[PDB]
TrEMBL record, chain C:
<dbReference type="GO" id="GO:0044178">
    <property type="term" value="C:host cell Golgi membrane"/>
</dbReference>
<keyword id="KW-1180">Syncytium formation induced by viral infection</keyword>
<keyword id="KW-0175">Coiled coil</keyword>
<keyword id="KW-0472">Membrane</keyword>
<keyword id="KW-1160">Virus entry into host cell</keyword>
<feature type="disulfide bond">
    <location>
        <begin position="316"/>
        <end position="327"/>
    </location>
</feature>
<protein>
    <recommendedName>
        <fullName>Fusion glycoprotein F0</fullName>
    </recommendedName>
</protein>
<feature type="disulfide bond">
    <location>
        <begin position="292"/>
        <end position="301"/>
    </location>
</feature>
<keyword id="KW-0812">Transmembrane</keyword>
<feature type="disulfide bond">
    <location>
        <begin position="12"/>
        <end position="373"/>
    </location>
</feature>
<keyword id="KW-1032">Host cell membrane</keyword>
<keyword id="KW-1161">Viral attachment to host cell</keyword>
<keyword id="KW-1234">Viral attachment to host entry receptor</keyword>
<dbReference type="GO" id="GO:0020002">
    <property type="term" value="C:host cell plasma membrane"/>
</dbReference>
<keyword id="KW-1015">Disulfide bond</keyword>
<keyword id="KW-1040">Host Golgi apparatus</keyword>
<feature type="disulfide bond">
    <location>
        <begin position="256"/>
        <end position="267"/>
    </location>
</feature>
Length: 455, 455, 451
C-alpha cells in the first residue's frame, strides 16, 4: 500500500510506482439455469380483482418466455459470428444446443441447486439453478387456474409471484436491448451471493478466491453474460468470469505532458512529448502495456486489466523513464510547434506545462495560491495542494497518500537545434528524430559544397 | 448463406465475403401517448395504513408528472462528415410543443388506441395510446381519496395501482438520467408487442418487415426515444425507428495488418498498412463504406450499418483486393518505420504480423502448437485452429464454419527502396507515394548529375 | 433566444451565434446518508406466508448491507473528474467523522458539518430504515413465536427497503461511482432543495433548477462509507462559475479546387471546429462534442476539456488572413464529398460526380449542388443528401446569413502548395510556400552560375 511517484524534469513526465497487478489471462464459464413452466394461457372463468392480478402477472411471464424465444432464433444468430472476448462462453452456449445436452444439466440439478456437469465437447462447468418458476407456478398457480372456474388466490400468493417473476422479467429486459450479450454482468444475471458462491467453487487457488471475492465489482465489469437457449422448459445462459493468471507483479502508470522551449516568442518554439502513456505491468518476463485508459480498473493497490487490450514490450521500456537516450530501447516521442499550456493530474501530483501568457497556479483550500508556475514544464505533489489552475480550467488534485520525488534534469528539448528540428512527428522515436536531423544536416552540407567554386 | 474469406499475402490483408446488407437509410417517427389524470393532492383526513399506501403511490405519481414537466424539450444537435441523428425525431417533437397540437392527437385517440394525425407543419404521424392512468385514477382511485371520509380501499387496489403506475415511473426514470433522449429503446418505452405492431405499419416492403421483426434487439439499439410534451392530461414522447432502405445487397469486411521488412536491425525497417479497413456494402451502383466498426452490427451473416457515418465509393474500390497496383482506383495506404507485432481476428481466420523477437504462435485445443510464425505477415484459417497467441496476449479464433482461401504473393513492401521510401505518410496512396519516390529519385540524380561537370 | 448563423463561402465554415453560456468550472460536494439498523437474522420460527415475506425482505436488506461493505471506495490536458468528491469521501473514513454527521443529524434531516479538515459540507438524511425496522418490524421477529404481521406491513417494508436495494444495484455494476446521478441516488425534490441550500448566486440557483436533467448528467455519486448503522455516499454537483456569457459554435467542411482531372486538386479545412464561449476576457474552446450539452439557446460545457484562447481567435471567422491570429487549417489532396449539419443549416462540400441535394418532404428537390463548397439553410429544407447518405437537418428556428467570398484555396499555387499538413496554420503553410519558392529559385540560380 505504498504509492510513490517520480517526476522527470528532463522529459516532462511522471511515473507512479508501487501498484500490484491482476491481469486477465483466462476465462471461466458457468451455466446459469432458470426452470420454466409449460403452462398455457389459462382457460378459467373468474373475474375477481385478485385473479385479475394473477392473470396479469401470468401474461407477463408468458410474454417474457415468448420474447426470449424470439431472441433465440432470429445456433442463435448472435452466437455464430463475431467475437474473441466471448468465444469461450460462446463455445459452451453452442454445445447446449446439441441433442440432450440440456437434459444432462436438467438431471444434475433435479436434486440439487448446484452441480458440476461434463459436456459433450469436453468442457467441465459449474451449473446453477438460480430460480425455479416451474415448481412455484405448477404447485401454487396451476391448481387455481387449470379449472373451469378459478378459485381466488391469497394476497400472499399475488405478492410472492410478482417477486419471483420479477427476476425473469428483468433478465428478458437486459437480454432484449443487449442482443443477448451483456457486460458488466448485472445483479439480475447473477446476484452477489451467487457470484460469491460461484467464485468459491471455481478450480482456482485459495488466493485467487481471495482476490476475486474482495473485488466483486471489478469482476463484474470484466465478465460477460451470454444467452444460450430456451428448451425443455429451461432457460440457460452462460456467465463468463475472468481468470487472473498474473497477480501481485509490479505495475506503474506513466503520465506525460508537452515539453517546449520558452524564451522565444510567438510561433517559434519546438515541442516534444513522450507518447507511451498508460499502464504498465510486469508479465512473464516482458511488460504488458495498456494504451487505452478504460481497460484498466484500479482499486487501492490493485490494477485490474485485460491482456487482450495490451501490447507486449521488453523490460527495457522502463529505461525510457531513467534515461530517454539509452541505447537499449528506442523511446517514443512526438514533436510539434504547438506552444499550448495544459496540465496533467497524476496519481498523487500534477504536471503543469505553462507557456506563453497563461497564468498557471496551484492552490490550497486555506492559503490560496501556493505556487505560481513559470514558463516551462513543472510539477507539484498533493501534499497541501488541492487544485491546479491552467488558464480558465481548474483541476482538482487526487488526495492520496504517497511519496513524491522530483528528479531534476535538463529539459531535453533544449538539446535540439530548432532550425533542423522535425516538428510534424505524429509517432516518432529518439532515433527516428536523429536520423531526420542528420539528413537535413547533410542536405545543408551537399548544398553548401555546390557553392565553393561558384561563390 | 456461406461465409468465405481470402487472405492476400502481398498486402497483409483479408476480405470476408458472403454477408447481406441492412442499411439504415432513413427514419420513421411515431408518437406514443399515455393518458394522465390531473389529480390534486388528496386532502382526505383518514389515517388507515392502506390509505397511506395509496397516498404514497399518488405522491410517486404526482412527482413523476412534475419531473416530466421539467424535461419539456428534446435536444439541440476517411474522416467523414457530421450529422444530427435525432434531428428527424426532434422535428416532430418541436411541432407537438405548438399550441393546439396536443389537442389534435387527443381527439384522434378518443375512440381508438392508434390513429394517424395531421399536425400543423404537414407532419403526419402514426399515434399510439399505450397506457390509460386517467381512467383508473379518476374512477377507481379518486372516490376513495376524494372526500374527507377516506373510504379505505381493498388491499387489491393498493397493489393494482402500483402495477399500473410502474410503467410511468420507469419511463420518467429513463428520461431523467438521459436528458429526455434514450437509446436503445427499452421495453418500458415501447414493449415488444407494441414495437412489432409499429413495424407492421411502416411504409416498407414485406421483406423489410420480416428483417426488423426478427432483429428486434438491433432495431432497439438503433432507435431513439425522445421526450416531447406533458400537457392537457397527456404525456407524449417521440419514438424514432430505423429505416432499412437497402437490404440483401452483398457486403464484405476488410481486415488489414502492418506489412514491414524482416531485416534484423534496431528499427531500420519500412512498414506499410492498407488504411481502408471496415465494412463494404453494395449500394445502388456504388459501394457504401463504413470505416468504424461500431456503426455496424453483425447477426450471423447480416450486417446492420448506419449510413450516417459512411463514405460513398465507386464500385472499383474492390480492385484494391485483386491488384493493389491497379490503375482504375488508387488504393489508400499508410507508411511508417513503426515496426511491432499484432494480430487481427478475421471472420474465419487470423492475421498475424510477427516482427522482431516476439513469440507468435497458433495452437489447437488438444494438439498443441501447430504453427510458429516467422517474421512478416502470415495468415491461419480457423480450420483446426482454436487460439492465436502474440506475446503475452491470447486471441480466440472464430469456430464459425466456412472456407478461406490463401492467395500467395510477394509482399509489396519488398518492392520499395528503403532509402527513397516516404516513411511517415499517415494518409497516402499508391500514386502519392510514387509521387514522392519520383521526386526524391529525380532530386538525388540531379544533384549527382550536377556534381559531374565541375571539372 | 435568437439563434443566428453565418456561412463563410471563402473558408467553407459556419458560425452559429446567439447562445448563452453555462460553464462548469468547479465542483460542489455534499454528503447523503441513509440510517440503517443493526437488525440481525431473525431466529423466530414461523411458517405464515406473511412471516416468510417479511423474512425474505430482511434478507434483501441484510445482503444489501453486506454488498455495500464491499463497495467501499488539438490535444488537451488530463484531469481526475471525481478527485474533489473522492477527497471528501476519504475524510469520512477517519474515526469520529461518521459520528459528527450522525450527531448533527440526530434531531434534523439537513445540517452543515465542518469535518476534521474544516470544510463546510451539507449533509442530508434521505431515508431512515433504522427507525422503521427497529419500531415496526423488530417486535414481530425478536421473539420465539414470530408474531404474524399484517399484509400492510409487508407492503410498506418492500417500499421503504426498495430504495436501498436500487442504490446498491447501481453502485454494484459501477464500482461505487455512478454518473449520471439517478433519481434513486438523489430524488428531484432532494436535488432541488440541495441546489437551494448551496452557497451560490440566485442566478446560478435558477439556472440549475431549470436544468435538473443536465445537472444529473454532469454529476457524480460516490460510494463512501458504511458503519455504525449509517450509510454515506458523496454527491458531486457541478459549479457553473461562468454564466450568461455569449457562446458560438464553429462548423467546418473541406474546401477544395474543382478541376475535372481526378487526383489534381488541393484541399483546405479549418480545424478549429467546436464550441467557443467568452470567459474572463479570454475565450474557452471546447473541441469535442461530448463535453457540451445544449437546451434551447443555453450551452452547458465542461472546462476540463477546454483550451483557453485569446479573444482574437474570432478574427478567423471575419478574416482568416488577419495578422493578429494564426488560424489553424489543414491541407490534403483528397477530393471527397461530405456534409455538415450546422445549427440551422447544412454545409455541403460536393466534389467530383457526387450527388448532392437538399429536399423538402412534400415539394421534393429544392437545391441541387454543383462542384465546390456551398450552404443551404433549414428554412424550407428538411433533408440534405450527399452520395448514399441522407441527413435530416435541425429544425431549430433562426436566421441564416450567406456571406459571399472567393474560396481561399483559389489563392494557392498547387505546385508549391504543401498538401500534407495534418496540423498547420495559415502562417505555417506560408512558410513552406516561401521556402519551396526560395529553393526552386536557388536551384535556377545555380544552373546560371555553371552555364
Amino acid at each position: 500500500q505504498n504509492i510513490t511517484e517520480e517526476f522527470y524534469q528532463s522529459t516532462c513526465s511522471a511515473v507512479s510506482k508501487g501498484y500490484l497487478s491482476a491481469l486477465r489471462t483466462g476465462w471461466y464459464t458457468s451455466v446459469i439455469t432458470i426452470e420454466l413452466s409449460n403452462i398455457k394461457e389459462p382457460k378459467c372463468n373468474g373475474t375477481d380483482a385478485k385473479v385479475k392480478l394473477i392473470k396479469q402477472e401470468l401474461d407477463k411471464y408468458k410474454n417474457a418466455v415468448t420474447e426470449l424465444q424470439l431472441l433465440m432464433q432470429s445456433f442463435p444468430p448472435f452466437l455464430l459470428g463475431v467475437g474473441s472476448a466471448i468465444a469461450s462462453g460462446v463455445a459452451v452456449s453452442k454445445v447446449l444446443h446439441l441433442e440432450g445436452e440440456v437434459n444432462k444439466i436438467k438431471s444434475a440439478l433435479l436434486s440439487t441447486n448446484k452441480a458440476v456437469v461434463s459436456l459433450s465437447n469436453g468442457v467441465s462447468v459449474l451449473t446453477s439453478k438460480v430460480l425455479d418458476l416451474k415448481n412455484y407456478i405448477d404447485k401454487q398457480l396451476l391448481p387455481i387456474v387449470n379449472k373451469q372456474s378459478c378459485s381466488i388466490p391469497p394476497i400472499e400468493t399475488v405478492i410472492e409471484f410478482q417477486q419471483k417473476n420479477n427476476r425473469l422479467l428483468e433478465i428478458t429486459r437486459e437480454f432484449s436491448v443487449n442482443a443477448g450479450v451483456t457486460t458488466p454482468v448485472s445483479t439480475y444475471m447473477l446476484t452477489n451471493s451467487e457470484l460469491l458462491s460461484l467464485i468459491n467453487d471455481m478450480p482456482i487457488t485459495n488466493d485467487q478466491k481471495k482476490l476475486m471475492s474482495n473485488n466483486v465489482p471489478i469482476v463484474r465489469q470484466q465478465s460477460y453474460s451470454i444467452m444460450s437457449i430456451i428448451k425443455e422448459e429451461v432457460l440457460a445462459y452462460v456467465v463468463q468470469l475472468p481468470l487472473y493468471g498474473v497477480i501481485d507483479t509490479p505495475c506503474w502508470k506513466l503520465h506525460t505532458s508537452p515539453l517546449c522551449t520558452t524564451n522565444t516568442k510567438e510561433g517559434s518554439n519546438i515541442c516534444l512529448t513522450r507518447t507511451d502513456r498508460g499502464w504498465y505491468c510486469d508479465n512473464a518476463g516482458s511488460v504488458s502495456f495498456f494504451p487505452q485508459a478504460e481497460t484498466c480498473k484500479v482499486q487501492s493497490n490493485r490494477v485490474f486489466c485485460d491482456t487482450m487490450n495490451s501490447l507486449t514490450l521488453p523490460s527495457e521500456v522502463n529505461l525510457c523513464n531513467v534515461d530517454i537516450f539509452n541505447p537499449k530501447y528506442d523511446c517514443k516521442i512526438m514533436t510539434s510547434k504547438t506552444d499550448v499550456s495544459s496540465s496533467v493530474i497524476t496519481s498523487l501530483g500534477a504536471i503543469v506545462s505553462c507557456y506563453g501568457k497563461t497564468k498557471c497556479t496551484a492552490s490550497n483550500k486555506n492559503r490560496g495560491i501556493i505556487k505560481t508556475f513559470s514558463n516551462g514544464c513543472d510539477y507539484v505533489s498533493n501534499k497541501g495542494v488541492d487544485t491546479v489552475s491552467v488558464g480558465n480550467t481548474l483541476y482538482y488534485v487526487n488526495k492520496q497518500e504517497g511519496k513524491s520525488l522530483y528528479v531534476k534534469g535538463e529539459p531535453i528539448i533544449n538539446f535540439y537545434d530548432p532550425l533542423v528540428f522535425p516538428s510534424d512527428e505524429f509517432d516518432a522515436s529518439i532515433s527516428q528524430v536523429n536520423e531526420k536531423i542528420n539528413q537535413s544536416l547533410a542536405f545543408i552540407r551537399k548544398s553548401d559544397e555546390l557553392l565553393s567554386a561558384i561563390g
